[PDB]
Amino acid sequence: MNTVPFTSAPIEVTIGIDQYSFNVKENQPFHGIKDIPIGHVHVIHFQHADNSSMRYGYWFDCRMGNFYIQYDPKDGLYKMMEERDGAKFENIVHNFKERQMMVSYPKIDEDDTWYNLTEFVQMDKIRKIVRKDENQFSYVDSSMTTVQENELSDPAHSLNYTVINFKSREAIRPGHEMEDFLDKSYYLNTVMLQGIFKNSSNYFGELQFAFLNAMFFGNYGSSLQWHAMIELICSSATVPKHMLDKLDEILYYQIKTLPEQYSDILLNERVWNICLYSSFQKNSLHNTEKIMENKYPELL
Amino acid sequence: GAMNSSNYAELFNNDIKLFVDDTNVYRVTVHKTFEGNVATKAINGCIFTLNPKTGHLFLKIIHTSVWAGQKRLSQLAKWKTAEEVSALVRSLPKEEQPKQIIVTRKAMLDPLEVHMLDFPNIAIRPTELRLPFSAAMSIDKLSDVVMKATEPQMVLFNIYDDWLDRISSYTAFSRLTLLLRALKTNEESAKMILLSDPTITIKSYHLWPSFTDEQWITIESQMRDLILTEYGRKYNV
Ligand SMILES: COc1cccc([C@@H](N)CO)c1
Numbered sequence: 001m002n003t004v005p006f007t008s009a010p011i012e013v014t015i016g017i018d019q020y021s022f023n024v025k026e027n028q029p030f031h032g033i034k035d036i037p038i039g040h041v042h043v044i045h046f047q048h049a050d051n052s053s054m055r056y057g058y059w060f061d062c063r064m065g066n067f068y069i070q071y072d073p074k075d076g077l078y079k080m081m082e083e084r085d086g087a088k089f090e091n092i093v094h095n096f097k098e099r100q101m102m103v104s105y106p107k108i109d110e111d112d113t114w115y116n117l118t119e120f121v122q123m124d125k126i127r128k129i130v131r132k133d134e135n136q137f138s139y140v141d142s143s144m145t146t147v148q149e150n151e152l153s154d155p156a157h158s159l160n161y162t163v164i165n166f167k168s169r170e171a172i173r174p175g176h177e178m179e180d181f182l183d184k185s186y187y188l189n190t191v192m193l194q195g196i197f198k199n200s201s202n203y204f205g206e207l208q209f210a211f212l213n214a215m216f217f218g219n220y221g222s223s224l225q226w227h228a229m230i231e232l233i234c235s236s237a238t239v240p241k242h243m244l245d246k247l248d249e250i251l252y253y254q255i256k257t258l259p260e261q262y263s264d265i266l267l268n269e270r271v272w273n274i275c276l277y278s279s280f281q282k283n284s285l286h287n288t289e290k291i292m293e294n295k296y297p298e299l300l
Numbered sequence: 301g302a303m304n305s306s307n308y309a310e311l312f313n314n315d316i317k318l319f320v321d322d323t324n325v326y327r328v329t330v331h332k333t334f335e336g337n338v339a340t341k342a343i344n345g346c347i348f349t350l351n352p353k354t355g356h357l358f359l360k361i362i363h364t365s366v367w368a369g370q371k372r373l374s375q376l377a378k379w380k381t382a383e384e385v386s387a388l389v390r391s392l393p394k395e396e397q398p399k400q401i402i403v404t405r406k407a408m409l410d411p412l413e414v415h416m417l418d419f420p421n422i423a424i425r426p427t428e429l430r431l432p433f434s435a436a437m438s439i440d441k442l443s444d445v446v447m448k449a450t451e452p453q454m455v456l457f458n459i460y461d462d463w464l465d466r467i468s469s470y471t472a473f474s475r476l477t478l479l480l481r482a483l484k485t486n487e488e489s490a491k492m493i494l495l496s497d498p499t500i501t502i503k504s505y506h507l508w509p510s511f512t513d514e515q516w517i518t519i520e521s522q523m524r525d526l527i528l529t530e531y532g533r534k535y536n537v
Contacts, residue, residue, distance in 0.1 A: 167410070169417050177414045178379035 002062035003093045003102065004044055005032035006078075007070040012049035013078065016057065016216060017105060018042055018114050019257060023049075031096040032069065035104040038062055040114055041121045044069065045216050046078050055217045056141035061123040064136045068092075080137045116253040117212065120205035129160050129209065140213055146221035159213070159221060162196055162206060164228040166235075183280065188236040200243045203229065204250055211254050214266055227271045234275035234282075244284045252287040255295065269299050276300070303402050304428035311352045312469045317400040318358075320385050321348040321433035322408050324446075325362050326377035342367050346446045347381050348433045349388065351398075352473050355460030360384045361446050361453040382411035388454075389419060398422060404431050432480035438487050441507050461506040466513060475520065479508070482523040485530045493522045 004017075012026040017033050024030050026049070036042060045057025058080040060067050065082045066089040072079050083089045096102055107114070123136075130138035146159040165171060171187045172180045180186050197203040207229040213222035233239055233247055258266060276282060276289045277300070293300065303310075311317065325347055328340035345362040366380065367373050389397050400423040401416075403409060413424045437443045445455050460472045467475070482490040500509045511519055531537070 167413055167417065172414055172417060177383065178376070178411070181410070181414050 001035045001105075002038055003032060003034045003097070004036060004060075005068050005089075005093050005096055005102070006030060007068065010071045010073065014047045014049070016043070016045040016047075019117070020106060022103060029101055030103075031099075031101040032093075032103075033105060034097060034102040035107075036062060037105065037107060037114070040118050041123050041126065043212065043216055044080070048077075054141050054143060056139065057216065058137045058139055059123070059126050059130070060137035064123060067137060080135070080139070082136060113253065113257060116249065117257060118208060119250070120201045120203075121208050121212075122205055125202065125205055126209055129206065131156070131158075131160060140217055140219065142217045142219055144219060144221070146225060148224075149221045159219070159225075161210060161221070161225045162192070164192070164225070164232055166232075183235070183237040184232055185236040185238040188232055189238065192232070200240070200246070204246065208250060208254075215254075215258060215262070218262075218265070223266055223268075227268045230275055231271050231279075234279040234285075237280040239281065239284075244281060248285040248287045251285065252291050255288060255291045260295070263296050263299065267296065267299055273300055302426045302428055309470070311473060314353070315400065316396070316398045317352065317402060318385075318398045319348075319350045319352060319402050319404060319431070319433065320381065320408065320412070321350075321404040321431065321436070322378060322381040323405070323434040324348060324437050325381050326367070326373050342373070344446045344449055346437070346442070347384055348436050349385060350433070350459060353469050355458045355464060355469070355472060357457040357459045358388055359442060359445070359455045359457055360388070361449040361455065363449055363452050366452070378408050378411045379415075381408060382415040385412060386415035386419075389416070389422070400425055402427050404429075404433055432477060432484045435480040435484035435487075438480075438483035438491070439507050441502075457507065459507065461503075461508055475516070478520060478523050478527075482526050485527050489526050489530075490523065493519065493526065 009024045009028055009030040010026070013024050014021055015024055015033075017036070033044070041059060041061050043057050043059050045055060047055050056077065058067075060080065065084075066086060068081050068083055068089070069078050070081060071077070083092075123138075126138050127133070127136075130140060132138065140159070144157055144159050146161050147155075148161065148163045148165070150158060151163075166181065166184065166187075170191060171184070173186060176186070193200060193203060197206075207226060210222045210226040210229065213219045214226055230247075230251065233243065272292065276285065276292060325345045327343045327345045329343060330338060330340050333339050342364045344364055347358075347360040347362065349358040349360065350356070362380065362384075367376075370376055385401065397419070399421075401412060402425050403412060404427060406426045409424060409426055416422055416424060437446065442457065459476060460469075463472045463475065479490070479494075482493070494509060500511060500515065502509045
């Protein structure tokens with residue numbers, strides 16, 4: 001079990017760690033978060049009490065270094081840093097743990113939620129989507145645009161998701177215009193899976209990372225990406241059986257976790273009714289469809 | 301974006317454009333089978349592709365053999381339209397390709413956009429106008445050429461005959477739609493109106509009769525009376 005210590009909390013803020021969040025009061029004696037399950041990628045994210053504008057936060061893997069949070073009062077935010085002196089980080093973290101100034105990552109032992117939400121998420125990929133190579137963690141916020149959103153302005157602060165466009169030459173083979181627009185299999189299997197992602201695990205990971213940035217940061221371009229990568233499978237008449245079965249598991253947990261009160265902005269009515277009721281895969285997502293009908297029958 | 305009554309004069313500017321109407325591409329007759337079930341027998345169609353500036357009609361004849369062995373024909377029809385329009389653009393020299401293509405039905409937007417991805421600079425647009433191009437097959441020579449066709453065939457017409465010698469294209473277009481609207485609302489009466497006077501002939505190289513300007517006025521008025529009429533006979537007013 002690993003630890004994200006905090007030098008202080010000078011400004012009141014709601015901290016999130018994965019699907020958990022807690023309130024810190026301005027200058028409350030808080031020094032961080034302990035007991036973080038090794039082996040997953042995590043997100044620690046912030047919403048200042050005073051300006052709910054801009055949720056932001058950091059993707060990290062504890063296996064990839066010793067990471068602390070320190071508020072910068074020039075830039076006005078909680079920033080993630082790395083301490084390379086490992087001796088020093090052990091002794092700093094021990095002192096705060098002896099003084100019990102850290103909250104504990106409160107994982108219930110029956111609860112696989114975080115795993116089912118980050119199964120294919122890998123830090124190495126997150127760092128290619130979020131380009132800032134001198135750090136081992138990756139910063140996101142609600143307002144970062146995606147590479148595709150910049151085609152339709154700062155390229156350094158973008159989300160370099162894979163571009164998916166159903167009306168592109170990439171997506172449509174000369175001579176198979178009607179075939180390839182109505183059944184996107186060629187684009188799913190040959191172009192994206194075989195060509196760009198190499199395998200379905202890289203694809204689901206981007207899909208899951210997309211989804212989590214929409215949920216945690218209300219990042220609109222990630223929501224667009226999450227929906228597109230769903231629609232691209234659901235609109236392919238030929239999908240490996242194991243991908244469908246995994247897709248039904250992935251989404252189901254995404255729908256279960258989603259705040260009940262945020263569905264109106266995070267869920268695209270059109271994509272979801274199409275995917276569950278019209279598309280080639282309308283009968284292949286039993287779990288996702290049963291949860292969606294029972295939690296959000298309004299959208300449908 | 302979409303084309304409507306406000307930007308109506310843009311049809312006649314010097315930016316090349318084409319209307320595409322796909323309503324006559326897939327045509328059937330529905331009939332009873334010996335077993336008392338119902339079946340369709342398709343008949344030849346045409347794509348109605350028109351430069352409203354010049355009157356040039358590229359009438360692509362769709363022989364029934366293109367439907368042989370195919371399913372979901374009404375959908376395929378829109379894709380077939382798009383493919384043919386796109387082949388028409390590619391065959392025209394560059395300075396002749398359109399800068400816009402207006403589709404008279406929104407369902408053709410996506411098929412044509414997908415077939416014209418190679419032409420990103422060509423604006424594919426819908427329209428709010430209720431254009432009567434569907435009545436094109438009420439023009440005898442056009443109908444005749446579709447129904448006689450034994451193979452796929454493209455035929456070039458000037459839908460305005462020689463009107464542009466005497467009137468502008470705005471007025472030509474407006475005369476055309478008024479004739480087509482009349483043919484569409486009451487084909488017989490419309491056709492009766494156009495030919496009542498045997499001394500007014502249709503030149504071999506034209507589609508419509510050789511009316512004087514004064515006679516077109518009289519003709520145009522009778523077509524309005526007809527359209528207003530059938531609007532009463534229809535709504536009882
Ligand atoms: C609060 O956690 C840590 C961790 C490592 C080093 C330090 C120092 N930069 C003091 O702020 C603090």
